[PDB]
């Protein structure tokens, strides 16, 4: 039989990476006080979270 | 097809031609296509009226309630239809729409009085 080993290897590698070298909140959950943006994505935030 | 937690969700499904809107409530998944695979079929929906109106709607509660208790969710139009039929309490969105219509009618009456 020809099992799908490359797919399982890639899945395991990606899981191990995303679980071990996960980016800390300081990198992705950061907030820019000049435009209210979150690094690692480059998107804005709701309007009800401005003055906060 | 293995969906991302495709839980049962009673949703609507088209079934008419161009210039002929027709729908049909069906107990399908939350991610399956509109006219795709489904488990059980419920009473079809008749949107367009006819001679003295014939807005007919039916439901098979014996199995609908069973599938609901089996872990199935409901959509917004499903809740609207349930409220229009009387099974579930009147949807609050319908009451808000009725209040907005009453306010619009009051504004129209005010405008008509201002016409003079």
């Amino acid at each position: 039989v020809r099992p799908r080993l490359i797919a399982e290897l890639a899945r395991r590698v990606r899981a191990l990476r995303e679980q071990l070298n996960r980016p800390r909140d300081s990198q992705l959950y950061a907030v820019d006080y000049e435009t209210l943006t979150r690094p690692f994505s480059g998107r804005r935030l709701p309007v009800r979270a401005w003055a906060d | 097809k293995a969906y991302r937690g495709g839980h049962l969700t009673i949703r609507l499904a088209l079934g008419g031609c161009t210039n002929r809107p027709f729908y049909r409530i069906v107990a399908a998944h939350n991610k399956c296509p509109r006219d795709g695979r489904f488990v059980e079929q419920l009473g079809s929906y008749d949107p367009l009226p006819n001679s003295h109106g014939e807005k007919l709607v039916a439901l098979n509660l014996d199995r609908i309630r069973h599938w609901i208790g089996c872990g199935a969710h409901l959509s917004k139009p499903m809740e609207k239809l349930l409220g229009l039929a009387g099974f579930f309490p009147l949807h609050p969105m319908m009451i808000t729409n009725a209040e907005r219509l009453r306010r619009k009618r009051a504004r129209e009456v005010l405008l008509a009085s201002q016409k003079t």
């Binding site: 804005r44 709701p46 309007v47 009800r48 | 309630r65 069973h66 609901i68 208790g69 089996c70 579930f88 309490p89 949807h91 609050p92 009451i95 808000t96």
Partner: protein
């Protein structure tokens, strides 16, 4: 409809998720209505679950 890895038509990135204004009395009335309606819906769901359990037992 967009499979993440796509040319993503850059036509929606120029908008602000602004929430329209709201009234006080109407908003509170609607909040109470939603709370009571959700309570009733949960009660009906619990009743249906109890009926299904009784049927399974029988």
């Amino acid at each position: 409809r967009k499979t993440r890895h796509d040319p993503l038509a850059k036509s929606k990135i120029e908008r602000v998720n602004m929430p329209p204004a709201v009234d006080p009395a109407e908003f509170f009335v609607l909040m109470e209505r939603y709370q009571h309606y959700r309570q009733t819906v949960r009660a009906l769901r619990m009743e249906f679950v109890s009926e299904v359990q009784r049927k399974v037992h029988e």
